[PDB]
Write an enzyme that holds these catalytic residues in place. Structure first.
Site: not given
Ligand SMILES: [Cu+2]
Ligand SMILES: [Cu+2]
Lengths: 620, 620
Positions: A374, A290, A425, A423, A295-296, A293, A298
């Site tokens: 997300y 995130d 985080h 997954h 750019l959070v 790749e 933004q």
């Molecule tokens: Cu999750």
């Protein structure tokens, strides 16, 4: 004024002008990244020199460039052409995301796959995800995005409820070509809708919730000067914002008596990766960086008063560059406020007859971002007692798939036929330390159990041990919750009144780190995520645990490369990189929209002060 | 009405009357413990029988008794003499703590020790601490207290700043004799004062804190009926209070649509031990069983509005018995209120164009208690999303000693010559489970890493595994933070719409457990504290993890004995006992009064609901 002030619209426009003047920003160029650079170590320039770093993409296929400009002097300090196949592709452009669905809509292979599933192409949304690096040789040096399909029944429908499993396509977003279309078979597309605002699903809204009014009659206790300089209950700091990292805290210091004592020079979430653990070929390549790749910053949300941030809120509206170098404001993208935090200290003494109670409070600096399905909230807290804490809040809609008929060891069921791939985080907090100055060291502290015997006849004794990490080669550490392991950052040259080096102790949550096989592409690309703590010697060009270019970039850069230099970190300018994250096995309760789950870390003073720093807090 | 209602002053007066007329409360008798008994399994028998359990002590040395009375019928159901040397001594009486200092005041040995130190006996306070069981055979069957001295320079002085090390005395509080005075040598008594209200130490008080107003214009969202029955945002429970355990939560249930679903039958902190790890003979025997030996509910503070509890507070003023059977009210000893808890769920969807944000809130039930130098806050939280959480807040003044010349591996320095022996605060949460009923089971869930190869070619897969605890002999579990270990309580006979047994997952903080040597007295007496999770088959007489009479018990009582029955817990009426605590190496920042430090645990729904249970929450 302050060299740590937020970038202004004017500065961004000036950078655009400088690049254009230098012949570096023609019609075919796009700004993939742009941010102000922090001032250099030590008093260099007689005055301030605001510099910006920019990653310039070329839509014609020409090689991109990394450029540093001095907006102050109106010059290009450096401009280098990049060989992406080697050093990495630039971050994904917001404009490239749309390309995927558009191109696939007219691809015979894609249409045949949708037809086999009786799906209307006009209702098939495509999630454009980063590609990573795998066995596709033709992708080397190309900007690829992989698309996964979801059916949207109508304009306001939540497509995530209708995943189209068994299908994935790869697209070259520069040449505008669909390189591959993979169909492993038809899976029923989950029919139930996940529209959380639909009365039939929510049922009558509860009317039992009475109002909670939080106000500050005399305004907040913190002051904001120079646009982003904060002063609150002895704390001092500058709130910065970078399109890649998001909110960044600079010069965190505490006013102890007549002296402003530094603690952390720069604190940020330098990377965030979301690796998926479903071995299906449809998603086995799925890993979101995130920060690196996408750019959070933004995608930071505009936060609404009373809803996102409750109470007396002071907003910052950071400015970033759009793809052409024009400034764009993120209105109310950062919330700042203080909140009550229960009891601070309390004691009712029998002998003295004195009953004492004091309340606590914390300063909060936060923002929220949205990456596809997300939404993540980033929260920084400063407490009256000197504690510093970070908390990430994960919410949004879970990424779905079909739920296999015969169950699955890597997917959970959320609804009939609807699955949620397992997954993680995982975040990386980069803490450029400055405990009472830059001369710092880190010690790993473990609780020590003792054996019953001579000198411990009753077998009740227990101790602690501290090991100084002296060289980067000895600074890649793992958690040990069983022995209460923590890490202390101290200043060997600054001692408290009891003649002990002042310090701060980092308390981790000790959650599992990266689970992928050590030989996987992701273990190499997200190497930082495999260990809980890393300590490096400060260097101007060592900014992210994954290096400058993460998109479609193999291992070779980042933390593993930095640590190899095996530099001295015993009483030097050091940086702590803490890995922490959540391992998610989605529950039914996470569907159709998930309630917030959190993770973080905190640092508490450890002999930094000569006594409690909150004895001067009034009873109020 | 409700058989779970709080005891009334009248009910306590009845017990006194009953015992009195039965000739069980003579001039030499004292009530060491008094509490109402919970209803037995199954209440199909109309009208309950309010019964009270009582521990009667005798100051003349006569054998103590355990008596059960019925206030409904006004009779003595049972009365059994206790052999303390075998089953343990009764809890310490508040009136016994006073005798220690008084007796030592006229003891030649004690006076000689103080004279050598030039300390005015009238200024020496003595902390009357529990004795435990060690090598003193003459103590078997006798009620002993061990005393540690602290100098109080004046009425309002904090004696904790002036510990008198190298000295300890043992006292028989019934025969009122000083059995021993040990003087291992003189240690300087720390001179600095620790008076946190002295302007000289606090310095000028801050005038920078602006007010924060928390109000509820329409009142609280929760309802209180029958005196202690709470209903809030779908939650239902009864708030009880016991002089030993403090606040106890009964019948925690959640209204899911048209069904009132039980989750936990009874939740409480059944024990709290504070073991010290200083091998010095002056303190190597120090272990506080705050709950079991002192009775934490007995010392609950009266919480001041706008001070201890801020906002719209609803108080409960529980009543307890004094040493003579007289009703004693603890005015505003329990705070109940709801508070905002930030964002509950949030998602801004690109495809649907729907931006959604909902706020969270929690119901808080708490109380604060004081045991000598420490003060502990016990907080229970109920969240909108179904999460249940507990949090202990530790504060007060650290127990001190001298800081030895040359340093120490078991004591930290707080001020010049002032030490703080290492210790732990370990709690045991007894959770009588009732997930959708009493037919429950427990599974240990571990994350499972997978090896790269066939079926996992990219080495990205990861899974999970669950192991059912079938017998008590295999229900003593330890934490494993590295593998993300948690424990799920489910009902194998109640499944969600996805055909999966409904459940709740316990998330521990994974803090270190008891550190003492396995063969130590404390390890045997507080065996519960050596492991993170215990599961037992429910039984009426298995109330505390340390047994009914903790004071001076040789060890092995409680959980170790219960588990030895090796009963079936696979789909039965079971109880979960979670051990959690803090390991404290006191910092300079903890002196002269310590800022709150916390620890706890929480349980989250795990496929208990058929989807998110907070979809009906309004936007507001
Ligand atoms: Cu999750
Ligand atoms: Cu402590």
């Amino acid at each position: 004024a302050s060299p740590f002030r937020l970038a202004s619209a004017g500065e961004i426009s000036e950078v655009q002008g400088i690049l254009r003047t230098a012949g570096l920003l023609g019609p075919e160029k796009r700004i993939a990244y742009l941010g102000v650079l922090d001032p250099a170590r030590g008093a260099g320039s007689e005055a301030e020199d605001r510099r910006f770093r920019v990653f310039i993409h070329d839509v014609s296929g020409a090689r991109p460039q990394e450029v540093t400009v001095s907006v102050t002097n109106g010059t290009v300090i450096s401009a280098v052409e990049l060989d992406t196949a080697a050093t990495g592709e630039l971050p994904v452009l917001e404009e490239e995301f749309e390309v995927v669905e558009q191109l696939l809509a007219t691809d015979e292979r894609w249409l045949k796959a949708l037809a086999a599933r009786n799906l209307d192409v006009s209702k098939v949304r495509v999630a454009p995800l980063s590609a990573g690096v795998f066995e596709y040789a033709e992708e080397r040096g190309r900007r690829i995005l992989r698309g996964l399909a979801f059916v949207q029944d109508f304009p306001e429908d939540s497509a995530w409820a209708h995943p189209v499993d068994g299908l994935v396509a790869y697209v070259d977003v520069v040449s505008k070509e669909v390189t591959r279309v993979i169909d492993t078979g038809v899976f029923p597309v989950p029919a139930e809708h996940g529209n959380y605002t639909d009365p039939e699903l929510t049922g009558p809204l509860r009317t039992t919730q009475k109002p909670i009014s939080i106000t500050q009659p005399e305004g907040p206790s913190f002051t904001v000067t120079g646009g982003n300089h904060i002063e609150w209950e002895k704390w001092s700091l500058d709130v910065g914002f970078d399109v890649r990292e998001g909110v960044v805290l600079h010069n965190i210091a505490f006013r102890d008596g007549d002296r402003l004592r530094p603690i952390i020079n720069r604190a940020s979430i330098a990377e965030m990766v979301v690796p998926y653990g479903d071995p299906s070929p449809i998603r086995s390549w799925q890993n979101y960086f995130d920060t690196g790749e996408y750019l959070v910053g933004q995608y930071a949300n505009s936060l609404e008063l009373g809803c996102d941030c409750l109470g007396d809120i002071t907003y910052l509206s950071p400015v970033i560059s759009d793809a052409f170098g024009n400034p764009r404001e993120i209105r109310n993208g950062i919330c700042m406020h203080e909140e009550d935090w229960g009891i601070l200290a309390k004691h009712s003494d029998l002998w003295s007859g004195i009953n004492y109670t004091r309340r606590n409070r914390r300063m909060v600096i936060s923002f929220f971002t949205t990456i596809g399905n997300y939404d993540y909230g980033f929260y920084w807290y400063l407490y009256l007692d000197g504690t510093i804490e970070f908390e990430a809040k994960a919410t949004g809609v879970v990424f779905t798939s079909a739920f296999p008929e015969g169950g699955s060891d890597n997917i959970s069921q959320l609804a009939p036929g609807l699955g949620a791939p397992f997954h993680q985080h995982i975040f990386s907090a980069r803490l450029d330390m400055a405990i009472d100055g830059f001369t710092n060291r880190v010690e790993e502290e473990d609780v020590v159990r003792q054996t019953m015997g001579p000198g411990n006849e009753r077998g009740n004794a227990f101790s602690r041990k501290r090991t100084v990490l002296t060289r980067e080669s000895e600074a890649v550490r793992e958690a040990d919750a069983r022995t209460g392991r923590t890490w202390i950052i101290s200043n060997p040259e600054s001692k408290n009144r009891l003649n002990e080096p002042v310090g701060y102790k980092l308390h981790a949550h000790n959650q599992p780190t990266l689970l992928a096989d050590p030989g996987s592409s992701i273990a190499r690309r997200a190497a930082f995520a495999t260990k809980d703590l890393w300590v490096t010697r400060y260097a101007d060009d060592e900014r992210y645990p994954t290096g400058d270019f993460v998109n479609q970039h193999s291992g070779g850069a980042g933390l593993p490369s930095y640590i190899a230099q095996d530099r001295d970190i015993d009483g030097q300018d050091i940086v702590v990189w803490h890995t922490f994250g959540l391992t998610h096995f989605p529950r039914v309760e996470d569907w159709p929209i998930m309630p917030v789950d959190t993770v973080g870390f905190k640092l508490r003073p450890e002999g930094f002060f000569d006594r409690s720093p909150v004895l001067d807090v009034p009873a109020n």
